[PDB]
């Protein structure tokens, strides 16, 4: 299926949850992976599973030091999931756009 | 880099009537976007973030939408204490720069000016020193024309103008014109004269007095 | 209720230093980054960059690189700005800012750069003329002359008096020294009965002077 | 190749509040997924996690001690620090300042850092006398020797002993600390030796007592 | 919230035989468990987490194994270094705890306790004099020391490398009592030695 597809497919609110939670100060970090596996390939469309996850948050991000929080949770979630970072993710313009 | 184009840099209205601000981006900011109202001799305050939030203590009249590249500030019903400045400010993660601002002013009905005239003081020319001042009392529009005369002599370069802030209630101006003469210079004439041009004046109105 | 409490005006000679602070409270300094923004005289809003007050890394803006630090103390919660090599030029107004929906703006900071030095202002009544409008209007007032820097706070009647009273703009003469007029507009009958007096406040010399202005 | 290093009073009065401050020494602290923790351990039991902290300040903390616990975390100054207010003889502990890895294929504490020795005591603090313990006292029977140092009247724990300035680490044997009538801790260590180096080789006994901050170097003789 | 009911003790193992340590958590931890490896006087080393996934520097002797309620930690060959006290810990919920701690001990060569004697040296000068005897080396850690000419304090080292442990008694004594005998006998009954065994000093 298409990139956007994809996302659309899982539930991301346990990323969204998990990222939230450590920004702001059952298992959220299990599910959010189990959803994430939920994909027909998570090496690829993981860049667009990423920014999705910052876009349905936007709302809740006060300022860019908040975005910039955001980013850094976001490309270490791959790793929280034992998962292959990928090497194109352009979350900085996708951050100031949404 | 992006780039804020805010349209009206300056803008006239009537009271009660809409207003619209617009600030329009060189490229997508998405939501990135704030309004503020500056009132002049004091510290701007925010009245929108995200673009269409109101902060708190903002008047339900203003308004803010848009997304992306076109964002707009309205009034739904502009007051005669909204004659501010007015700027959009982007605050995405690149960038934190303002609009060009957008200068407000309230049109209301000709009120002409009164005019006084004020000599030197006693205290003032025992310093060498002759300071006349003509005052220009709550005038609509701003455009006035002040001339001195001494003796019936046009006087040039000495005098300097100063303009007070539309009136947040009043949405008036007033004027003062300071005549700087030495007191040699102040007792060689008698007559003083403030001339005054204005529109709502039918004929040029002059307020003079006998001293020096 | 987020407060951002800026540092007092400051007056400086060319080449000097000056540093700006900035603290905060009603909210965690934390959360949010600082902003700051220079208004020169007269002009819009330039944003100078901001710092991260989480990790105190600052950004600054291209035309506010290199003279322009920004720094911080979190254990107080203030953020500091610290210009080098003053200017002329950089004589404006420095504002600290966040944004968001706890954002808010600092009452800022005017820095002035000049050679001159600071001097109090002399008062001089504006008395009101004797053939004034019976029945009507008459107009009196104060000229607050010589003085620098800015600014002068000029009240009536220890501030019980506001309505009708204008406050001109300061005017730099060629002296080098400003000078404004205050004036009221007064009921004509008022006058002898009634005193009205001026109270003229320079901080930067730290001169109040109270001026009766009587015909 | 990052290490942890803790710092803070060694005797803390029973009605003050505890206060311990870890140093980071990569510049991690703004990393993701690194909660900074710390766990104590009294003598004579085991460990018990008392909080984990991030550094945008989401923390979690033991729920028995959560009322008397306080954590921040300074992020310019690569440092972390835990305060503990109301101290009772029960938070008398080693306390320790660990790493806490938040993965879902690894949760634990990576890396942990040397520890402070916190006692909670009204007694003021003392330093260490230190008196030798000479080697064979004139009879060598077999090919090795013994010899040592008998570390005396300190207070409180704990006092670290090195021999030849750690250059002598073989048959070294530094004893438990022994609380004494008087209230004053006391050890001895002692290492065996070939007796055909008496004579020829020095020993020294380096003696530091961190909470008096006391530093003292005897040597020993036949 | 989850407790960790760990295994007692582990009773003294020989080098070689197989130790198994087990850790219980009244709710299921899942598979966020781990072991911690603690010598004396050491700070907790990581050796396993999560499920079967041992650490770095860790030896392939280490292995885990155990679903979210049961858990397992076996060291397959004992070695003298593995002496330690080991604690299993969790974060499958926020409230992290700890398990009891099972101390194993290395079974070895009844050995035998090598005795020294150290009068007291110039601690008189205030005067109280301490008469120390050192055993070195010794496995069975039931020993005796009796001070014949009762205040004597005996502190004991733990486990080593040779897995011996060592004792040493402090005789504590003022200087009026100790001018009093010129001999200070030191016999221990160690139970590993063919006979007791006597040092003394003169003076």
């Known amino acids: ?98 | 880099d992006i780039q804020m184009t805010q349209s009206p840099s300056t803008l006239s209205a009537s009271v009660g009537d809409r207003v619209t601000i617009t600030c329009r981006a060189s490229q997508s900011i998405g939501t990135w976007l704030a309004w503020h109202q500056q009132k002049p001799g004091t510290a701007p305050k925010v009245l929108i973030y995200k673009a269409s939030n109101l902060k708190s203590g903002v008047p339900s009249r203003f308004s803010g939408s848009g997304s992306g590249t076109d964002f707009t500030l309205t009034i739904s019903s502009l007051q005669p204490d909204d004659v501010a400045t007015y700027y959009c400010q982007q605050y995405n993660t690149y960038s934190g720069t303002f609009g060009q601002g957008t200068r407000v002013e309230i049109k209301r009905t000709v009120a002409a000016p009164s005019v006084f005239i004020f000599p030197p003081s006693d205290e003032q020319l025992k310093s060498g020193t002759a300071s006349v001042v003509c005052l220009l009392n709550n005038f609509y529009p701003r455009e006035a024309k002040v001339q001195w005369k001494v003796d019936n002599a046009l006087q040039s370069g000495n005098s300097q103008e100063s303009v007070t802030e539309q009136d947040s209630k009043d949405s008036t101006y007033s004027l003062s014109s300071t005549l700087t003469l030495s007191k040699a210079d102040y007792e060689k004439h008698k007559v003083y004269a403030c001339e005054v041009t204005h529109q709502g004046l039918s004929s040029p109105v002059t307020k003079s007095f006998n001293r020096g | 209720q987020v407060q951002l409490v800026q540092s007092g005006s400051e007056l400086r000679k060319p080449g000097a230093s000056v540093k700006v602070s900035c603290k905060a409270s009603g909210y965690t300094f934390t959360k949010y980054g600082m902003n700051w923004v220079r208004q020169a005289p007269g002009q819009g809003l330039e944003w100078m960059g901001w710092i991260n007050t989480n990790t105190a890394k600052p950004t600054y803006a291209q035309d506010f690189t290199g003279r322009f630090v920004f720094s911080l103390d979190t254990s107080v919660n203030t953020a500091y700005l610290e210009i080098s090599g003053l200017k002329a030029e950089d004589t404006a107004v420095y504002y600290c800012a966040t944004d968001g929906s706890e954002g808010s703006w600092g009452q800022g900071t005017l820095v002035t750069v000049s050679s001159a030095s600071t001097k109090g202002p002399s008062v001089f009544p504006l008395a009101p003329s004797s053939k004034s409008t019976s029945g009507g209007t008459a107009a009196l007032g104060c000229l607050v002359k010589d003085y620098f820097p800015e600014p002068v706070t000029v009240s009536w009647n220890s501030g019980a008096l506001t309505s009708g009273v204008h406050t001109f703009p300061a005017v730099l003469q060629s002296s080098g020294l400003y000078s404004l007029s205050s004036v009221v507009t007064v009921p004509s009958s008022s006058l002898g009965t009634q005193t009205y007096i001026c109270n003229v406040n320079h901080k930067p010399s730290n001169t109040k002077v109270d001026k009766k202005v009587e015909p």
């Open chain 1, 1 to 98: 299926m298409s990139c956007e597809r994809q996302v659309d497919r899982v539930n991301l609110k346990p990323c969204e949850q998990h990222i939230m939670q450590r920004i702001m100060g059952s298992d959220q970090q299990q599910r959010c992976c189990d959803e994430l596996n939920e994909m027909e390939n998570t090496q690829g469309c993981m860049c667009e599973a990423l920014q999705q996850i910052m876009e349905n948050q936007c709302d809740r991000l006060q300022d860019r030091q908040m975005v910039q929080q955001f980013k850094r949770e976001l490309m270490s979630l791959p790793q929280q999931c034992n998962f292959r970072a990928p090497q194109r993710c352009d979350l900085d313009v996708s951050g100031g756009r949404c």
